[PDB]
Design an enzyme around this catalytic site. Structure first.
Site, short mmCIF file in Angstrom:
data_model
loop_
_atom_site.label_atom_id
_atom_site.label_comp_id
_atom_site.label_asym_id
_atom_site.label_seq_id
_atom_site.Cartn_x
_atom_site.Cartn_y
_atom_site.Cartn_z
N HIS A 130 9.08 9.39 13.95
CA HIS A 130 9.62 10.76 13.68
C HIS A 130 9.37 11.37 12.62
CE1 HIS A 130 12.20 8.94 10.43
NE2 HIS A 130 12.05 10.29 9.99
N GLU B 60 -1.57 6.02 -4.81
CA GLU B 60 -0.73 7.05 -5.48
C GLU B 60 0.33 6.09 -6.17
OE1 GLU B 60 -0.38 11.02 -5.34
OE2 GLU B 60 -0.31 9.38 -6.87
N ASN C 135 2.17 8.33 -9.30
CA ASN C 135 2.98 9.47 -9.80
C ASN C 135 2.45 10.51 -8.81
OD1 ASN C 135 3.63 11.98 -11.24
ND2 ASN C 135 4.45 10.91 -12.83
N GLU D 63 0.87 13.10 -11.25
CA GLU D 63 0.13 12.78 -12.13
C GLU D 63 -1.24 11.90 -11.50
OE1 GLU D 63 1.51 10.79 -15.42
OE2 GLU D 63 3.13 12.06 -15.90
N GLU E 201 -3.89 8.76 -11.98
CA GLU E 201 -4.10 7.43 -12.61
C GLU E 201 -5.18 6.88 -12.33
OE1 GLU E 201 -0.94 9.05 -11.42
OE2 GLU E 201 -0.66 7.77 -9.71
N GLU F 251 -6.37 7.01 -6.82
CA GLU F 251 -5.81 7.91 -5.56
C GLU F 251 -7.25 8.15 -4.52
OE1 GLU F 251 -5.33 8.83 -8.98
OE2 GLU F 251 -3.16 9.66 -9.17
N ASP G 7 10.71 3.59 16.55
CA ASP G 7 10.38 4.58 15.31
C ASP G 7 9.20 3.97 14.71
OD1 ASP G 7 10.26 6.89 14.03
OD2 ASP G 7 11.77 6.32 12.63
N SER H 292 10.98 7.56 4.67
CA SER H 292 10.97 7.09 6.13
C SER H 292 9.34 6.99 6.34
CB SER H 292 11.32 8.11 7.05
OG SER H 292 12.80 8.16 6.95
N1 LIG Z 1 20.23 6.27 4.32
C1 LIG Z 1 18.96 5.97 4.54
N2 LIG Z 1 18.55 4.71 4.47
C2 LIG Z 1 17.98 6.97 5.05
C3 LIG Z 1 18.28 8.21 5.54
C4 LIG Z 1 17.35 9.12 5.91
C5 LIG Z 1 16.15 8.73 5.94
N3 LIG Z 1 15.36 9.78 6.51
C6 LIG Z 1 15.69 7.73 5.43
C7 LIG Z 1 16.60 6.61 5.18
CA LIG Z 2 -0.68 11.70 -8.10
#
Ligand SMILES: NC(=[NH2+])c1ccc(N)cc1
Ligand SMILES: [Ca+2]
Ligand SMILES: NC(=[NH2+])c1ccc(N)cc1
Ligand SMILES: NC(=[NH2+])c1ccc(N)cc1
Ligand SMILES: NC(=[NH2+])c1ccc(N)cc1
Ligand SMILES: [Ca+2]
Ligand SMILES: [Ca+2]
Ligand SMILES: [Ca+2]
Ligand SMILES: [Cl-]
Ligand SMILES: [Cl-]
Ligand SMILES: [Cl-]
Ligand SMILES: [Cl-]
Ligand SMILES: [Cl-]
Ligand SMILES: [Cl-]
Ligand SMILES: [Cl-]
Ligand SMILES: [Cl-]
Ligand SMILES: [Cl-]
Ligand SMILES: [Cl-]
Ligand SMILES: [Cl-]
Ligand SMILES: [Cl-]
Ligand code: NA
Ligand code: NA
Ligand code: NA
Ligand code: NA
Lengths: 54, 235, 235, 54, 54, 235, 54, 235
Positions: free
Chosen positions: H41, H55, H57, H60, H62, H65, H89, H185
């Site tokens: 998704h 990566e 920060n 920032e 380091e 990267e 997914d 995600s």
């Molecule tokens: N609540 C969740 N674990 C969550 C919600 C949205 C999302 N895109 C990823 C995880």
């Molecule tokens: Ca960075």
């Protein structure tokens, strides 16, 4: 008495009600008979029925 | 169908035959006046399909037959022949003109998912079709039927190197001699509930028909009944 | 057995009959020359039990029969008639004198737990006995047998208000007319594997014999095969 | 090839070995036949066998 | 709406009624609160409750 | 309890200690004023057992304690130490005189089988007791508690050569350092539901306490809640 | 002794052999250590490994 | 990640961030020098995606990267946003140029299906990402991580009206306050096995982040490990 045992005596479908009661129901083209357990045709050619003499 | 018996006229009034480049290449079941349910692998073709309901002897006239053209095919959205020819093996055919319901042209009942599975788990279903009467054999003239027992899932998985998906079930006999076969695919696997038949499977595939140690593989319709009702709705 | 067929002599050479205050009150199976496996509820009595092997017609002489006395009964340690008459329904009978093995007196094979369950899941077993030929009926004279299909567990639980424990399985037909019955309890439920029969169940109980919507209930032997081998060991 | 498929072609019992090999075996009173898959009687009255003419 | 989803919003026990309705209930020593979902003490020392200041 | 924390007074007002030939040899939970639920293996002895409720420091006085004698022990009917020390590890103790219910002496709630299992499957329970604070160590003076996660059944079976029965569940940590231990057996495994604790397990056994790759083994109370209610009924 | 118990003492993967023996193995970038149970890096940056000081 | 902690540099050297029209819209994991595994998704867009490995920060430098362009996206063949946004997914991103492996850019291990599931069933995984630190909140600057327990499947299904497919699992806490969130995600759910982390899930979705009575929903990677290895093969 319960849908969990002998389908609550419903010929086709059973739904549990409050206090150990059940409601019987039937598929499309059928209606719940007088006994409130059996299913009977409610249309000319109900599904899944053999009407030609065997 | 290998090792079955001749149906009597109107014994399976939901059964239809699919005709194309070749006659009786698959079967199907009447959902309603405008829709047939069959196997998706049957209708993975560009050739035009004809549906025949009220059929008994595919080479005789009983005066109970009704021919229709297919105007649209809806394979289940998960079916993907590139990945697997038989997983999610279900499709719907829209007819050009409605069938006229009678003693020989009657829909198959379709319960919800829970009850379709309860019905399947009763363990004894009827399969019917005009498919081969022997492995590599001729088609049947008179519609054939066969009662087949449900097979334990682990037993079925042990019977073959091919993947048996959770969208399929197995049914038939270990001993060989009785099974569905080429030309029956798409047709019904039904379970009779107090004289009312419900669709519990779609005849899908197998290895050599009616071979010892092998079973018939069927689409597990319970997983698709909602989709059937949603896509075939008339009003 | 209701709705079965007469066995041919030596067709079930592991079958034995148990005789007491009443003849043929239960059956059993030969484990080896000194031991019979039966149902524990059969032998929850103080009356002396006689075992008869090589038996065909319980009222005729075939010249193939062997009578023994029971010197010890080992009910499974979990069986408890006070809590439930049929849960863990299995027992072993030690004979006073060894049976003489021949074409009519042959042990039943007993696989390990994994294979006994694989064999059960093939889904088709034979039950045999001299039990009633109809519900509340007379006993059979000639040993009866019946092929019974395995029944889905949830389907069996839905068929009765009585608890079906995981130590039991169901087998038989929905339609009524074919089932084991009083007097068959204790006898074998076997599965044939390439001509070699293996013990897959013990005939245990049911409600009214061969009633529509009801099944035969059997002890699931796979859970007890280790105990059978451990308790019946000779050398 | 594997016990998971057609019992590794063993008539009775199968055990998986290293590198997609299997060893077939039989119940008491039986021995592994020449083909190393089938089971044959190794005693006068092997269990579970019908020897009286049917 | 249904016992199958979020316990039909019952704090403790849920039972399905006819037509997508549910009845909430509580263990011994508790009563169904005003909201018909929550459980409140109906006795001096209800089970499973910590009443000593923490 | 290894790696837990000191309870606060009245934090587990259902907890009781069992004293015999040795103090704090097991725990228990208050079912009602006259009955304690504990592990059957705790009370497989001929020595007299004393129950202490409202207990916090087993060597101090808080002025909240209540000592009772046990007049009858009901091990579950399936428990059989000869076959297995821990399968069906549950028993009930009847007290000579009723406990007086207060903020420090409060019963644990007990749901039906379905809800006890739903509560267990929330996956996080509290165990408490005066058992050893290290494997082979000294007992705790102040009641200890520990939150333990439920462990997947196959993962638990893979962790040990000992049989994990379906009457048991596993809970605890892989990493070692936190677990119930000797002297905690018999005590509660509870699950908090909106501030109301329900009994979800009985502390039963394990191998070395708080060992890496090992888990605590608990009696699965859901299978026994009906029996608890049936045997402890007062009116 | 068996893959069914404590992964046959293999750190990563286990396969059952004939007669209660097992063969341990490791993921890509790892090799079976001297003890024939443990997995050790066989490449400069083996997968899933934290090599930066923590 | 809501309620987690700052990672230390190189603590999750397989973690990558995905940048597009918006920075850190999703995460991913290094399969090998040319391939990232993420959530399908995340990459259901026509906008160009940049991958950043090593990566720590996201605001920032380091000096650890490595930025790459995505030249091809392979969503799993079963993923279908029209039917369901989160079922199956999982997707793979091919990078234009290989990443250079080092202490800060290291692949995640991927076991076969059986072992990925065994690892998942150990019940405790780490999730990491630069997603929101509160529901509807700002992104994290420093990579966050959180240990999450596996949740029983029936418990997860009871927690929501949304369908939890068998291609998903749930993990997290009932009590609210700790969970993955928007922007995480696509990132990894890993299980540490004797110091070696294996990919056990893909961070996928949930309702409101870290809400009481709700869980994080993850792609069950075990069902896709073969496809990952087959599609990402280099030699
Ligand atoms: N609540 C969740 N674990 C969550 C919600 C949205 C999302 N895109 C990823 C995880
Ligand atoms: Ca960075
Ligand atoms: N059951 C079978 N062996 C079978 C069924 C349909 C078919 N097309 C091929 C084989
Ligand atoms: N199968 C049966 N209905 C049955 C079997 C044995 C028996 N004792 C009673 C009933
Ligand atoms: N959880 C344990 N390791 C344990 C619990 C009780 C006990 N008696 C022994 C060990
Ligand atoms: Ca015709
Ligand atoms: Ca006789
Ligand atoms: Ca004290
Ligand atoms: Cl032909
Ligand atoms: Cl048959
Ligand atoms: Cl039926
Ligand atoms: Cl009589
Ligand atoms: Cl039949
Ligand atoms: Cl077989
Ligand atoms: Cl001490
Ligand atoms: Cl932790
Ligand atoms: Cl909860
Ligand atoms: Cl923002
Ligand atoms: Cl926590
Ligand atoms: Cl681990
Ligand atoms: Na066959
Ligand atoms: Na019957
Ligand atoms: Na541990
Ligand atoms: Na939460």
């Amino acid at each position: 008495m319960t849908c969990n045992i002998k389908n609550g005596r419903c010929e086709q479908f059973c739904k549990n009600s409050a206090d150990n009661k059940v409601v019987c129901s039937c598929t499309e083209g059928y209606r719940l008979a007088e006994n409130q357990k059996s299913c009977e045709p409610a249309v000319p050619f109900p599904c899944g029925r053999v009407s030609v003499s065997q | 169908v290998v090792g079955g018996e001749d149906a009597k006229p109107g014994q399976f009034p939901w059964q239809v035959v699919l005709n194309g480049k070749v006659d009786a290449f698959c079967g199907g079941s009447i959902v309603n006046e405008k829709w047939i349910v069959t196997a998706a692998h049957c209708v993975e073709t560009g050739v035009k399909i004809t549906v025949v309901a009220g059929e008994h002897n595919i080479e005789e006239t009983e005066h109970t037959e009704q021919k229709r053209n297919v105007i649209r095919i809806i394979p289940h959205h998960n079916y993907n022949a590139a990945i697997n020819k038989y997983n999610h093996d279900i499709a719907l055919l829209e007819l050009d003109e409605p069938l006229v319901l009678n003693s020989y042209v009657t829909p198959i009942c379709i319960a919800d998912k829970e009850y379709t599975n309860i019905f399947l788990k009763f363990g004894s279903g009827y399969v019917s079709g005009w498919g081969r009467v022997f492995h590599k054999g001729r088609s049947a003239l008179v519609l054939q039927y066969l009662r087949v027992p449900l097979v334990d899932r682990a037993t079925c998985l042990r019977s073959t190197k091919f993947t048996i998906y959770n969208n399929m079930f197995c049914a038939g006999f270990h001993e060989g001699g009785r099974d569905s076969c080429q030309g029956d695919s798409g047709g019904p696997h039904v379970t009779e509930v107090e004289g009312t038949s419900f669709l519990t499977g779609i005849i899908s595939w197998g290895e050599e028909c009616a071979m010892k140690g092998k079973y018939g593989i069927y689409t597990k319709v319970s997983r698709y009944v909602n989709w059937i009702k949603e896509k075939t709705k008339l009003t």
